[PDB]
Design a protein around this nucleic acid. Structure first.
Lengths: 206, 125, 78, 95, 60, 149
RNA sequence: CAACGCGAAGAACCUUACCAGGUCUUGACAUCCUCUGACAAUCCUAGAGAUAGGACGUCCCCUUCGGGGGCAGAGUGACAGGUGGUGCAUGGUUGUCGUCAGCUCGUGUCGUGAGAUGUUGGGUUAAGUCCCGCAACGAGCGCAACCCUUGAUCUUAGUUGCCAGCAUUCAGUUGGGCACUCUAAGGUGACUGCCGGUGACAAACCGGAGGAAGGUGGGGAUGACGUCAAAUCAUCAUGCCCCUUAUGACCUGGGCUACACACGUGCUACAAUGGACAGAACAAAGGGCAGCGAAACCGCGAGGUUAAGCCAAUCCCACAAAUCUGUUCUCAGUUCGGAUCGCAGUCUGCAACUCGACUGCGUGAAGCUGGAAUCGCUAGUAAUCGCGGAUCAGCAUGCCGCG
C-alpha cells in the first residue's frame, strides 16, 4: 500500500492540466492525438531533454508550448530543425500547428529533468550512491526547500533488489498547499530494470 | 403579509402568512388531503401553540422538494422564520423549545466498498 | 422466433435443394448447426459438426421448427 | 443576441465573462448580466489496483459548468468589433 | 499474443456485431470508458500525469 | 467512552397530560411510520367500547402492572455462570415493559393486530396476561437468586 | 483475516488464450533492400478461411524529365510473435496491520559495547495534542490544518428558472418583474471567541449564553517507517528455452454456462402490520446525436406504425414506489409463495439448440421463521422503498451513485 501521486492529487487546485483545451464530441480523438504528439516530441527530443509540454486548441488549430533551456539551444542551430520537426506534427495532426519554446531557468529544481539526469547517470554505469547524493545537494544549493529522491531495482547486488532513498530538507506531502513537483523515470541496465522517483518542495501557494 | 424561508431535508418551503382565522394552505391546496398524518397536522400548529399565536394567522405556502415529513419540517422552519420576522419579542422563548435550528440532518453519502451508507458486506472466515 | 421467418444459410440450402430434386440419397456435410430445420427436407440425412466430429442424423416428419443443432449434443457426460 | 459559453474551470470562465460584458458595454451595447447557468457534474469510478481488490476505489469527476449571456440589441456596428476577441482554449463559445 | 488481434480490432470485421472495443493506448479489451476509449490502468496513469483536460480527483 | 442519551416523540410542552401526550405522540415502536399512528388510535376506541371508562386509564394501569422492579443478568465466575440480580433504571423500566407488551402482542395470535394488542392491554390491566406472566417469572427468578448481590 | 456478484464497468460469434477440424509462412502487425508504377473495390462458382479465374478491372505531388516525395502491390534476408515460464530477477502499481499513533535523524551527553537520552515522568486530548519538569537542545515524516462537499446569510447575476401583486388561461404557458426559491462566483461565518466553575494562573476539562451551526458541527479526499519473498511477467524488461514448414498466425464449430456433491456472497418468499382491485398523492441525482426519442393510432403484451421537440435549468429519458383513502378476501400450504415446466408471441442481433431478456396462457414446487454456530449497524444510521448510471445493439438479484 503506497502513496497517492502528489501532482496527481494537486492537479486542478494548485496545478493546471497541461492540456488546456475544451472539447465535446471530439474529446476522445483530441486526447488521442495529444498523446500521440506528446509521445513523438518526447521521443525525438529526449536527447535535448524536455520536462513538460502543454497543448492548446483554437479553431481546430493546435498550438504547443515546450519547456527547458536546451530547446533554447534548439532555437538557434535547430531553428531550421524546429520547422523541420513541426512539419511532422503538421503531417500527423492533419491541420497545421504552432509552437513556442519557454526556457526553464534553474533546471536543478524541475522534477522530470532531475529524474532524467539520474536515469542517465545510472545507465552510463555510475553508482547510485554518488549520483543521488550529489544531485540532492545540487538541487538544494540551487535553492529548493526540500528534496526526497528514491531509486529501486537490482541496485548492483544483482541477485536481489531493494529500495533506497536520500533526503535533506522539509517536504510535506500530506499538506494540500505545498508545491511538491513530482516526476519519475525508468532506467534500463544490463543487470535488470531501474526506476527513479524524485520530488522537490519548492514552496507553498497563496 | 409576512414571509419566511423553510428548509428541512432536500425540501424548501417558502411560507407567506397573513392575519386571518386559522386557515392553512399548501401549494394553493388544503392539508387535510395533501398530508394525512395527524402527527403532521400538529406540525403547522406546534409553534403557534407553544406561543399563543394560534388562530390569528392564516398561511399560504409554496413548497418543493423532499417527501411528506421533510416538507412538514420545511413548514416548521419557514413559519418559524416568518413568525420571528413578525415579532422577535418572544424569540428567546421560541429558541428555548428550538424549532429554529436548521437541522443539518441530510442523507449520508453512499461510499464504495460498503453496502448502503454504513452496511459493510458480510464477513466469514 | 420472429415475424420475419426462419433463418437458414444459402451455402447449405442450395446444395440440399438440388439434392432433394435430383437424388435424395447421399449424406450432406455441414459445419453449421445454426440453420433452422425446414418442412420440405424430411428423410434426408445430415452430418452436423459437434465441435469434434460431424454426427449423421436422420430427419423425421415431425422435426419441424427446430434446428439441426438440437440433435448434436456437443458436451459429453457420465 | 443569445450567446452561450462554458469551460472546465470557473477561474478562466469568470474573467472570460467579465471581459465579454465589458467589451460589449464600453463599446456601446444593451446587455444582460452573466447569469450562471447551473453546472453539471459527471462522476467516474475506477479500481485502485490492476488485478484485485474491487473494494478499493477512487472517484474522478469531469466537473463542468455553464454560463449564459445575451445582448438585448444586436448593435451591428459593435458586435463586429466584439467578434474579434481572443480567449483561452479552456472556454467554449457559440451563438 | 496481442499484436494480431489489436490489428483485428483495427480492421473492420465481417459483421457490425464483431467490432468489440479495445483500449487504444494500452491494448486491454476489458473495462474501457467510451468517453475516452481508454481503460483504467493507462487512464489513471495519464490522469495523474495531468492530461484529460477536464477531470480531477473527485471528493464529496 | 461515557453515558449518552436522547429524547424524542415529544408532545407539546404546556397544558399536556399523558393521555394527549400519547394521543399525539409517543410509543409506536412497532416499525416504520404508518402501520402505526394507525393499527393504533383505534385499538384505544375498541376498548372504550369494551370498558365503560376512559380507554387511556387502562393503558398505563396495565403498564404499571407489567413494570418489573428487579431483574437478573449473567456474569462469568469460575465455572458456574451465576445469575446476578440487579435493579432497573427509570427509563430501562419503561422501555423493556413496553417492549414486552408489543412483542407479545405480535406473538399471541388472533384475527388481527389491533384486537390482539387491545386484548393484551386488558389482560395486563387485569393481572393475567402473557407479558405479565414473563414479568413474574423474571421476578421469581430474581429473588430466588437474590443472594448474589 | 487481507481469495471465493474477485481480474470480468457484461462470454451466442466476436471477447477467447483453450479444444476438434480445415489452412499460411519475412508472416495481420514494424524498419531496412530491388522492382511496378499511385493502388484498390464491386459482383460471379466451391466458399469457412482462402484460393481458380474473371467483367472497369492495379488510374498521385514535384520534376532543366535525371530522378526524387508518398502511396500501395510483388520478391527479398536481416527480422516481427510470443495472454509461453519465472511477482523468490524487477520496474510501475495495489491490499494488509491502519487513519492506528507512532517512526526517525542533526548536535550534544552517559556507557566500553550492544546501546540509552531526546521519544521518559503530571495531567491532557483522538492524537509524539499541549503545557510543566527533565542532559538534553532542535529538526524531519506522521496528527492537525491548508482541499472538496452539506449545513445560515450578504453582494452580483435574473434565462431555458421563479411567478409576491395584477389581466388572462387547461398549457404562472403569456403580458410584465427578479419580489421569493433556485442557480454559481466572491465574502461572512465557529475561532475556545466570551461569562462562571474546576484545574497552580499553565495546558486543558465542565456548565452557560449568544448562535444556522460549540468544542476536530457532519461526511469525503489525504494512508508515516515498514511486515507479510502478500498479489500482478495479462502495461514492462536482462534471463533461458518455442520457433518462425511452430507454443507464431487466419477461418468454421464447441467453452469458459458441464453437474453425482461442498462452501462463499446475494435476490425472492414463508403472510392479514398481508394479497388483490380502484382512487389520491409527494419527487432526487444523472443520461440523451449511428442519441434521447413526444403526441396520437395498432396490440389486453412484450412492442410496432408514423414520428413533434431536444445538442439539452427549454425537449425526452421520466406516469419515483413505499405511503394515504376505500371494496373484497377470513387463516389454510391459502387469492401467500412463485420455482420448474408445455403452448403462443415481442425485441435485438446474419445468428437466441448448447447459450439472452421480456411478455400472454396453462401451470403451480419447496417453504408456514430455520440446529451447532455466525454477521452489519451508534440517528437521517440500520430497516425498508424505489430512481438513475459505467460496462453497451441484447444481456444486472452484481457494482457505482441518488433520494
Amino acid at each position: 500500500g503506497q502513496k497517492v501521486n502528489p501532482v496527481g492529487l494537486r492537479i486542478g487546485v494548485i496545478r493546471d492540466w497541461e492540456s488546456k483545451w475544451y472539447a465535446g464530441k471530439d474529446y476522445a480523438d483530441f486526447l488521442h492525438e495529444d498523446l500521440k504528439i506528446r509521445e513523438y516530441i518526447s521521443k525525438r527530443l529526449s536527447d535535448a531533454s524536455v520536462s513538460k509540454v502543454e497543448i492548446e486548441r483554437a479553431a481546430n488549430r493546435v498550438n504547443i508550448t515546450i519547456h527547458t533551456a536546451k530547446p533554447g539551444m534548439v532555437i538557434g542551430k535547430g531553428g531550421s530543425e524546429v520547422e523541420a520537426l513541426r512539419k511532422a506534427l503538421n503531417s500527423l495532426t492533419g491541420k497545421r500547428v504552432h509552437i513556442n519554446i519557454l526556457e526553464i531557468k534553474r533546471a536543478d529544481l524541475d522534477a522530470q529533468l532531475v529524474a532524467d539526469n539520474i536515469a542517465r547517470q545510472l545507465e552510463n554505469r555510475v553508482s547510485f550512491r554518488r549520483a543521488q547524493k550529489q544531485q540532492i545537494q545540487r538541487t538544494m544549493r540551487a535553492g529548493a526547500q526540500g528534496v526526497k529522491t528514491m531509486v529501486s531495482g537490482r541496485l548492483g547486488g544483482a541477485d536481489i533488489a531493494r529500495s533506497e532513498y536520500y533526503s535533506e530538507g522539509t517536504v510535506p506531502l500530506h499538506t494540500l498547499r505545498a508545491d511538491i513537483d513530482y516526476a519519475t523515470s525508468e532506467a534500463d541496465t544490463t543487470y535488470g530494470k531501474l526506476g527513479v522517483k524524485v520530488w522537490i518542495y519548492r514552496g507553498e501557494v497563496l | 403579509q409576512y414571509y419566511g424561508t423553510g428548509r428541512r431535508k432536500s425540501s424548501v418551503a417558502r411560507v407567506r402568512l397573513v392575519p386571518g382565522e386559522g386557515r392553512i394552505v399548501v401549494n394553493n391546496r388544503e392539508i387535510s388531503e395533501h398530508i394525512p398524518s395527524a402527527a403532521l397536522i400538529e406540525d403547522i400548529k406546534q409553534p403557534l401553540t407553544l406561543t399563543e399565536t394560534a388562530g390569528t394567522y392564516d398561511v399560504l405556502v409554496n413548497v418543493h422538494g423532499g417527501g411528506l415529513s421533510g416538507q412538514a419540517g420545511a413548514i416548521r422552519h419557514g413559519i418559524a422564520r416568518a413568525l420571528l420576522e413578525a415579532d422577535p419579542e418572544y424569540r428567546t422563548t421560541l429558541k428555548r423549545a428550538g424549532l429554529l435550528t436548521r437541522d443539518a440532518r441530510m442523507k449520508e453519502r453512499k461510499k464504495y466498498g460498503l453496502k448502503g451508507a454504513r452496511r459493510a458486506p458480510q464477513f466469514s472466515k | 422466433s420472429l415475424k420475419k421467418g426462419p433463418f437458414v444459410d444459402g451455402h447449405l440450402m442450395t446444395k440440399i435443394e438440388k439434392l432433394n430434386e435430383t437424388d435424395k440419397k447421399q449424406v450432406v456435410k455441414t459445419w453449421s448447426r445454426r440453420s433452422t430445420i425446414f418442412p420440405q427436407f424430411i428423410g434426408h440425412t445430415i452430418a452436423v459438426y459437434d465441435g469434434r466430429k460431424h454426427v449423421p442424423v436422420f430427419i423425421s416428419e415431425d422435426m419441424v421448427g427446430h434446428k439441426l443443432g438440437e440433435f448434436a449434443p456437443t458436451r459429453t457426460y457420465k | 443576441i443569445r450567446i452561450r459559453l462554458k469551460a472546465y474551470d470557473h477561474r478562466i470562465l469568470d474573467q472570460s465573462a467579465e471581459k465579454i460584458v465589458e467589451t460589449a458595454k464600453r463599446s456601446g451595447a444593451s446587455v444582460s448580466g452573466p447569469i450562471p447557468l447551473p453546472t453539471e457534474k459527471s462522476v467516474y469510478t475506477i479500481l485502485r489496483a490492476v488485478h484485485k481488490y474491487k473494494d478499493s476505489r477512487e472517484q474522478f469527476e469531469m466537473r463542468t459548468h455553464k454560463r449564459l449571456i445575451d445582448i438585448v440589441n444586436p448593435t451591428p456596428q459593435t458586435v463586429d468589433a466584439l467578434m474579434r476577441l481572443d480567449l483561452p482554449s479552456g472556454v467554449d463559445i457559440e451563438i | 499474443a496481442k499484436k494480431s488481434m489489436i490489428a483485428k480490432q483495427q480492421r473492420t470485421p465481417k459483421f457490425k456485431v464483431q467490432e468489440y472495443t479495445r483500449c487504444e493506448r494500452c491494448g486491454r479489451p476489458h473495462s474501457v470508458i467510451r468517453k475516452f476509449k481508454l481503460c483504467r490502468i493507462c487512464f489513471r496513469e495519464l490522469a495523474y500525469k495531468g492530461q484529460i483536460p477536464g477531470v480531477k480527483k473527485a471528493s464529496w | 467512552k461515557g453515558p449518552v442519551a436522547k429524547r424524542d416523540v415529544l408532545p407539546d410542552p404546556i397544558y399536556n397530560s399523558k393521555l394527549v401526550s400519547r394521543l399525539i405522540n409517543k410509543m409506536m415502536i412497532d416499525g416504520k411510520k404508518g402501520k402505526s399512528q394507525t393499527i393504533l388510535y383505534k385499538s384505544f376506541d375498541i376498548i372504550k367500547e369494551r370498558t365503560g371508562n376512559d380507554a387511556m386509564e387502562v393503558f398505563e394501569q396495565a403498564l404499571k402492572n407489567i413494570m418489573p422492579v428487579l431483574e437478573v443478568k449473567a456474569r462469568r465466575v469460575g465455572g458456574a455462570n451465576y445469575q446476578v440480580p440487579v435493579e432497573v433504571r427509570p427509563e430501562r423500566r419503561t422501555t423493556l415493559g413496553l417492549r414486552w407488551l408489543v412483542n407479545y402482542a405480535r406473538l399471541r395470535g388472533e384475527k388481527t393486530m389491533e384486537e390482539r394488542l387491545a386484548n393484551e392491554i386488558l389482560d395486563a390491566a387485569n393481572n393475567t396476561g402473557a407479558a405479565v406472566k414473563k414479568r413474574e417469572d423474571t421476578h421469581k427468578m430474581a429473588e430466588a437468586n437474590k443472594a448474589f448481590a
